[PDB]
Amino acid sequence: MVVGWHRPTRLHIDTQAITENVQKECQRLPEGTALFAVVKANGYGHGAVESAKAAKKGGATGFCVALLDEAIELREAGVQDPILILSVVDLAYVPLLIQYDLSVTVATQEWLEAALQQLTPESNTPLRVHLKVDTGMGRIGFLTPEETKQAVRFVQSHKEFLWEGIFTHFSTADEIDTSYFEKQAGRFKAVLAVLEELPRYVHVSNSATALWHPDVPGNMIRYGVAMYGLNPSGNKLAPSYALKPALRLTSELIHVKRLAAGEGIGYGETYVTEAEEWIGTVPIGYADGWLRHLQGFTVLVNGKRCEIVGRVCMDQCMIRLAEEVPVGPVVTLVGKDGNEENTLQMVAEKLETIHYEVACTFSQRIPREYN
């Protein structure tokens, strides 16, 4: 697939915003605490490499990725810092981990026992492994205190290995009620407790934890959404410091026409003109990530809100303009214009999801520009 360069639709990524967002968080964490920038899913749709480079200038000394291929892309970009693949890697790819000196998470001894084989008798390239203990997310990890204790000692029983860290992940750190959270921490504590040695990286925090549960054991935080300026808790809580939106979505009217009252517009004729109306055509559709369920949403033109009317097409949608306008004026889908602003949170709410998903859904067909 290609990216719509010759089309007015565009995604603007304010890099400095990321940097600012990262710097400010670094300032609120102890001097013995590292900031790892998690840029998975192509930097949550903003672009990994750039998010990665912007995150570094802010104080980040490590990176968190979700796939082997994503960790490799960073290396290929010149990223020379620790990179942690947040999930289970296929044994068939162990050698790749050694080649790019990537850090992997381990969730079972089975993987480690098999990983040992296919691993040089004494390699000068030990495999950096972070053991994940699952005290509540229910996804992956050891359900120790005993299981981890066995995993760790096994990891140290072999020069082929090198355990960089041990971590857990909270499922409700963005929740008003903190009862469940406190339980996960208990399970993590119960469990470093059974050990006698600790790796260099003991991490448990994500954006939400870092913002609302600061006084929590650990020396390294995995900073995600917050660095792109998005409130990790939707609109349930206020960040500890003013985040700064890094994503803007722009397009332009490429056709403007007046329709008589009583005319149907779009598929299924879900909409019918109520009177003389000015309808403008915008070159962005669901195939670009501007989902169909966005119909009643309003975008910006010349500082005024305009209702998308009618079914959102695959490659475009229609907005009822306020007053007659030529084609060409810029249409702000996400971002500020005049006294009005469209937040990714707003789009998420219209879609009944979280901005996490909205940002990740924006197709690659939409060119991203960084400044």
C-beta of 186: minimal distance to its own copies in Å? 14
Element spanning 365, H or E: none
> Would you mind telling me the total number of residues written for the chain in this entry?
371
State the Cα–Cα distance between residues 195 and 254, nearest whole angstrom: 64
How many CB atoms lie under 10 A from the CB of residue 99?
Answer: 12
Q: What amino acid occupies position 186?
A: G
66 binds ligand PLP (CB under 6 A): yes
Q: How far is the CB of 269 from its own copies (least distance, A)?
A: 5
Per partner kind, with CB cut-offs from 5 to 8 A, the member of ligand PLP, its own copies, none near residue 226 is ligand PLP
Look at residue 102 and give its three-state secondary structure.
Answer: coil
Q: Is 57 known to be catalytic?
A: no
Q: Which helix (H) or strand (E) holds 205?
A: strand 201-205
Query: How many angstroms separate the CA atoms of 309 and 320, rounded?
Result: 6
Residue 106 contacts its own copies per CB under 8 A = no
Tell me how many residues contact its own copies (CB under 8 A). 80
Rule CB under 6 A: is residue 207 a binding residue for ligand PLP? yes
**Interface with ligand PLP in residues 208-237 (CB under 6 A):** 208, 222, 224-226, 232
50-69: contacts with its own copies (CB under 8 A) = 66-69
- For residue 299, the cross-strand partners are 306
Q: What residues numbered 27-46 form the site for ligand PLP, per CB under 6 A?
A: 38, 40
In this complex, which beta carbon is closest to ligand PLP, that of residue 222 or of residue 365? 222
Nearest approach in angstroms of CB 45 to ligand PLP is 12
Single out the segment in contact with ligand PLP by CB under 6 A; choices: 69-77, 192-200, 205-213, 317-325: 205-213
Backbone angles phi, psi at 105, to 5 degrees: -95, 145
Give me the torsion for CA of 86, 366, 300, 261, rounded to 10°. Answer: -120
257 binds its own copies per the rule CB under 8 A = yes
Q: Contacts with ligand PLP in 93-122 (CB under 6 A)?
A: none
Judged by DSSP in three states, 235 sits in coil
With residue 23 as reference, give the H or E element that holds it.
helix 15-28
Closest CA to 148 of 106, 201, 182: 106
Q: Which residues lie near ligand PLP (CB under 6 A)?
A: 38, 40, 66, 86, 169, 206-208, 222, 224-226, 232, 314
Q: Which residues are annotated as a binding site?
A: 44, 139, 207, 222, 224-225, 314, 356
Q: Which residues are annotated as a binding site for pyridoxal 5'-phosphate?
A: 44, 207, 222, 224-225, 356
Which residues are identified as catalytic?
Answer: 40, 267
